């Protein structure tokens, strides 16, 4: 029973049979969020907090991918800079990753990257 009930008006509604509801496989006690059906991850059917009951999934999957992609790079960046991989050019002797951000924004190379990320994200905003 994908539908929340079976009726014609929501005063004489006949709720679906309890054993016949679809139910999420991740959270077994919750009904399946049908708005997620069709999207890639929509087989674990995990959406408690009901943030897809309110917001178009196109937005959330856009935000989910951007977070994951940006974290996959950031995790690699932190690991490599910590293991010690400073770029070939000089002026890149930040000694430690934790102080790399404040060091580089002082040097002047972070303002460049923030601009380059900014323009691509503004282009992303038009795309989204």
């Amino acid at each position: 029973x994908x539908x929340x009930x079976x009726x014609x008006x929501x005063x004489x509604x006949x709720x679906x049979x309890x054993x016949x509801v679809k139910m999420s496989p991740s959270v077994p006690y919750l009904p399946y969020p049908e708005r997620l059906e069709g999207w890639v991850g929509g087989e674990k059917g995990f959406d408690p907090l009901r943030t897809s009951d309110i917001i178009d999934v196109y937005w959330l999957r856009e935000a989910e991918l951007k977070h994951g992609r940006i974290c996959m790079l950031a995790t690699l960046g932190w690991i490599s800079v910590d293991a010690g991989w400073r770029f070939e050019a000089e002026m890149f002797q930040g000694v430690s990753v934790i102080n790399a951000h404040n060091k580089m924004v002082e040097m002047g190379v972070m303002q460049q990257m923030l601009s380059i990320v900014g323009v691509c994200e503004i282009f992303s905003l038009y795309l989204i």
């Binding site: 929501x10 969020p33 708005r35 009901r50 897809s52 009951d53 309110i54 917001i55 178009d56 503004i122």
Partner: protein, 79 residues
């Protein structure tokens, strides 16, 4: 400055001016970029408000529309 008004002259009220610049040209340009973004978005919004809603989109536009699951609840919760 040539002050006017009794109180400014009889109290010595002065208007200090910074000898520095305030904001550098780079900061003004950074503000102007986002001002231009506001400007483009506002022109688009003005166009959309001028033309208004198009109800006949269901005959030509793709997709099938969407009512968010909370919007349905708000519909059937009352008015």
């Amino acid at each position: 400055r040539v002050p006017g008004g009794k109180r400014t002259q009889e109290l010595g009220l002065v208007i200090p001016m910074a000898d520095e610049d305030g904001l550098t040209d780079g900061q003004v340009a950074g503000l102007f970029v986002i001002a231009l973004v506001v400007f483009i978005s506002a022109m688009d919004l003005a166009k959309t408000m001028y033309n208004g809603i198009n109800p006949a989109k269901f005959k030509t536009s793709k997709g099938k529309g969407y009512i968010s699951p909370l919007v349905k609840r708000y519909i059937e919760n009352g008015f």
